[PDB]
Design a protein around this nucleic acid. Structure first.
Length: 49
DNA sequence: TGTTTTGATAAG
DNA sequence: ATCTTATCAAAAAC
């Protein structure tokens, strides 16, 4: 199996960024991961909260 | 001639 | 004119 594109530290970190209005397009670049991958790990439905 | 996640992309 | 979601070929590592 392929390796996850993001460890735990990055997740909650990205998680917090997304709850500040940071565009997923921005955080894909900074962390080097696909935008679509950001929607899977952090659905927009689980952030509005 | 053989599992797990990524990420482009169409669809809503 | 975006934002999101669901999908799925294929990469990546075994």
């Amino acid at each position: 199996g392929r390796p996850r594109a993001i460890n735990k530290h990055e997740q909650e970190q990205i998680s917090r960024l997304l709850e500040k209005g940071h565009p997923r397009q921005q955080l894909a670049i900074i962390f080097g991961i696909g935008v679509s991958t950001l929607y899977r790990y952090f659905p927009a439905s689980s952030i509005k909260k």
